Amino acid sequence: PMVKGLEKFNELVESFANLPTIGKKTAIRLAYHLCINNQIDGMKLAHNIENAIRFIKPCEQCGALSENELCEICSDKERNKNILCIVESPKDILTLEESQSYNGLYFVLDELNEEKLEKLKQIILKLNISELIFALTHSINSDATIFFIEDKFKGLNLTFSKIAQGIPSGVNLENVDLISLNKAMNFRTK
Amino acid sequence: LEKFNELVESFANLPTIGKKTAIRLAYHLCINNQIDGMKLAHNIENAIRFIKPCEQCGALSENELCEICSDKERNKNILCIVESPKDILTLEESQSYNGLYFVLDELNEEKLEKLKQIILKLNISELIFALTHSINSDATIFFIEDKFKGLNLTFSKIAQGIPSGVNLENVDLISLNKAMNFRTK
Amino acid sequence: PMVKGLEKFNELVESFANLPTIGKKTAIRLAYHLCINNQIDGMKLAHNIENAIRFIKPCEQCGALSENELCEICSDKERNKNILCIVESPKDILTLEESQSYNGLYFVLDELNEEKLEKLKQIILKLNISELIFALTHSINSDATIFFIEDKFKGLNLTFSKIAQGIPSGVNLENVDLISLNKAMNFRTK
Amino acid sequence: PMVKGLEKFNELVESFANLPTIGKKTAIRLAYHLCINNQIDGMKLAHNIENAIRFIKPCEQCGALSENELCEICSDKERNKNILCIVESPKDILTLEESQSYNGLYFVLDELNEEKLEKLKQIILKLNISELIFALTHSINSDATIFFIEDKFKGLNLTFSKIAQGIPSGVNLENVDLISLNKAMNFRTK
Ligand SMILES: [Zn+2]
Ligand SMILES: [Zn+2]
Ligand SMILES: [Zn+2]
Ligand SMILES: [Zn+2]
Distance D118 CA to ligand 4 centre (A): 16
D-chain residues near C55 (CB < 8 A): 8
Percent composition of chain C: helix, strand, coil (DSSP 3-state, to 5): 45, 15, 40
Same domain, C116 and C171: yes
Task: Provide Rg for chain A, Cα atoms.
Answer: 22
Distance in angstroms (rounded) separating the CA atoms of residues B161 and D164:
5
Residue C133 — φ and ψ, nearest 5°?
-90, 135
Residue at B121: amino acid letter: K
Q: Give the whole-angstrom CA distance, residue B61 versus residue C2.
A: 53
Quote the CA–CA distance of B85 and B68 in Å, as a whole number.
12
Q: Give the Cα separation of C132 and D130 in Å (integer).
A: 79
Please, are residues D52 and C9 in contact by the beta-carbon 8 Å criterion?
A: yes
Contact indicator for B53, B63 with CB cutoff of 8 Å:
no
Measured N-to-C along each axis, helices D39-55 and C7-17 cross at an angle, to the nearest 10 degrees, of: 150
Element (H, E) at B154: strand B154-157
Q: Which residues of A touch B47 (CB under 8 A)?
A: 8-9, 11-12, 31, 34-35, 42
Which candidate from C8, C43, C52 shows the least CB-CB separation from D35?
C52
Residue of C nearest to A135 (CA): C185
In a domain, B165, yes or no: no
Nearest CA-CA distance, residue B119 and chain D, Å: 19
* Nearest residue to D163 (alpha-carbon basis) of D112, D90, D88: D88
Give the domain CATH number at C99.
3.40.1360.10
Question: Judging by beta carbons within 10 Å of its beta carbon (0-12, 13-18, 19+), is residue A35 exposed, middle or buried?
Answer: buried
How far is ligand 4, taken at its centre, from the CA of residue A21, in Å?
A: 52
CA atoms C5, C11, C16, C17: torsion sign: positive
Ligand found nearest the CA of C72:
3
Q: Of D188, D182, D134, D184, which Cα lies nearest the Cα of D158? A: D134
**Cα A121 to middle of ligand 1, angstroms:** 15
The answer as to whether A31 is a domain residue is yes
Task: Give chain C's largest Cα–Cα span.
Answer: 68
What's the rounded Cα separation, in Å, for the pair B160 and D188?
8
Q: Is A103 on the interface with C (CB under 8 A)?
A: no
Give B62-97 as a DSSP string.
SSSS-TTTT-TTS-TTEEEEESSHHHHHHHHHTT--
Asked if A182 reaches chain C (Cβ–Cβ under 8 Å), the answer is yes
- Residues in chain B with CB shorter than 8 Å from the CB of A20 are 24-25, 28
- What is the distance between the alpha carbons of residues D181 and D179, in angstroms, rounded to a whole number? 5
CA dist list (Å): A139 to A20, A111, A150, C173: 21, 16, 16, 12
Give residue B45's domain range: 2-50
Q: How far is CA A152 from CA A120, A145, A155, B126, C49, in A?
A: 11, 10, 8, 75, 59
How many structural domains are present in chain D?
2
Taking the C-alpha atoms of residue C42 and residue D16, their distance in angstroms, rounded to an integer, is 10
Distance, CA of D173 to chain centre: 29
Give dist(CA B157, CA D189) in Å, integer.
Answer: 5
Residues A29 and A72 placed together within one structural domain of the fold: no
**Which letter does DSSP use for residue D117 in this model?**
H
Neighbour count for residue D97 (Cβ, 10 Å) = 18
Q: Kindly state whether residue D61 falls inside one of the protein's structural domains.
A: no
Residue type present at position B39: K
DSSP string, C64-106: -EESSSS-TTTT-TTS-TTEEEEESSTHHHHHHHHTT---SEE
Amino acid at C88: E
Whether residue D135 contacts residue D85, with contact meaning beta carbons closer than 8 Å, is answered with yes
In DSSP notation, D40-105 reads: HHHHHHHHHHHHHHHH-EE-TTT--EESSSS-TTTT-TTS-TTEEEEESSHHHHHHHHHTT---SE
Q: Which of A128, C67, D180, D112 is nearest to B162 (CA)?
A: D180
Shared-domain flag, residues A48 and A94: no
CATH code of the domain in which A34 resides: 1.10.8.420
Distance CA C107, CA C87 (A): 6
Strand partners, A132: A84, A160
User: In this structure, which ligand is nearest to the CA of D108?
Assistant: 4
Between the CA of D62 and the centroid of ligand 4 the distance, in Å, is 4
In a domain, D176, yes or no: no
| Distance spanning both ends of chain A, measured CA to CA | 61
Residue A89 lies in a domain: yes
Q: Is A166 in contact with C171 (Cβ distance < 8 A)?
A: no
| B83 and B126 together in one domain | yes
Is any Cβ of chain A less than 8 angstroms from the Cβ of D31?
Answer: no
B83-88 long-range contacts, Cβ below 8 Å, gap at least 24? B83/B131, B83/B132, B83/B137, B85/A36, B85/B53, B85/B58, B85/B59, B85/B60, B86/A32, B86/D173, B86/D174, B87/B130, B87/D173, B87/D174, B88/B57, B88/B59, B88/B60
Residues A38 and A126 grouped into a single domain: no
Spatial contact of C135 and A172, defined as CB atoms under 8 Å apart: no
3-state secondary structure of A114: helix
Residues making up chain D, counted from first to last: 190
- Considering the domain architecture, whether residues A32 and A74 belong to the same structural domain is answered as no
- Determine contact, residues B7/A49, Cβ cutoff 8 Å: yes
Please give the method by which this entry was determined.
X-ray
B67 vs A28: CB contact, 8 Å cut-off? no
Which ligand is in closest contact with the Cα of D60? 4
Residues of A whose CB is below 8 A from C163: 166-167, 181, 184-185, 188
Cβ–Cβ gap C21/D6 under 8 Å: no
Measured between alpha carbons, how far is A189 from C133 in angstroms, rounded to an integer? 9
* Chains in contact with C via at least 3 Cβ–Cβ pairs below 8 Å: A, D
Neighbours of B77 (CB within 10 A): 12
Tell me how far the alpha carbon of residue B101 lies from the centroid of ligand 2, in angstroms. Answer: 7
Q: Which residues of A touch D174 (CB under 8 A)?
A: 25, 29
Residues B74 and B143 in one domain: yes
Q: Order of strands, edge to edge, in the sheet holding C131-134?
A: C105-108, C83-87, C131-134, C159-162
Closest by CA to C76, choosing from C110, C50, C112, C105, is: C105
For residue C77, what are the contacts with CB-CB under 8 A and spacing of at least 6?
A: none
Could you write out the DSSP letters of every residue in C139-155?
SHHHHHHHHHHHHHTTT
SS3 state at A11: helix
Of the candidates A122, A128, A85, the residue with the CA atom closest to the CA atom of residue A103 = A85
Same domain for A182 and A140, yes or no, is yes
- First-last CA distance in chain B: 65
- Helix/strand/coil percent split, chain D, to 5: 50, 15, 40
Residue D84 bridge partners (DSSP): D105, D132
Residue C109 lies in a domain: yes
Dist CA A142 CA C167 (whole Å): 13
Residue in C closest to D5 by C-alpha: C72
C25 found inside a domain: yes
Sequence-separated (6 or more) residues with CB below 8 Å from residue D13: D2, D3, D24, D27, D28, D31
Judge whether A133 and A146 are in contact, CB under 8 Å. Answer: no
Residue C133 makes CB contacts below 8 A (sequence gap 6+) with: A185, A188, C83, C84, C85, C86, C102, C104, C161, C162, C163
C38 and D5 in contact (C-beta within 8 Å)? no
Amino acid at D33: H
Report the DSSP pairing between strands B52-53 and A65-66: unpaired
User: Is residue D36 located within the same domain as residue D96?
Assistant: no
Q: At what angle do helices D7-17 and C39-53 cross, to 10 degrees?
A: 150
Rounded CA separation B55/B63 (Å): 9
Q: Answer whether D71's CB lies under 8 Å from D65's CB.
A: yes
What is the length of chain A?
190
Query: D90 alpha carbon to ligand 4 midpoint, in Å?
Result: 10
**CB distance from D113 to chain C under 8 Å?**
no
* D65 contacts D87 by C-beta, under 8 angstroms: no
Tell me the β-bridge partners of B53: B60
- In angstroms, what is the span from residue B176 Cα to ligand 2's centroid? 36
Closest chain D residue by Cα to residue A28: D174
Residues A44 and A112 in one domain: no
Residue B60 touches chain D, beta carbons under 8 Å = no
Q: How many residues does chain C have?
A: 190
Alpha-carbon distances, residue C164 vs A44, A146, B169, C184 (angstroms): 46, 21, 46, 8
3-class SS string, D161-180: EECCECECCCCCHHHCCHHH
- Of the candidates D32, D34, D51, the beta carbon closest to that of C49 is on D34
User: Which neighbouring-strand residues pair with D90?
Assistant: none
Say whether both B102 and B42 belong to one domain: no
In sequence order, the 6+-apart residues with CB closer than 8 A to the CB of D55 are: C8, C9, D67
β-sheet bridge partners, residue C108: C87
Residue count of chain B, please give it: 185
Tell me: do A21 and A49 sit in the same domain: yes
In-domain check, residue B177: no
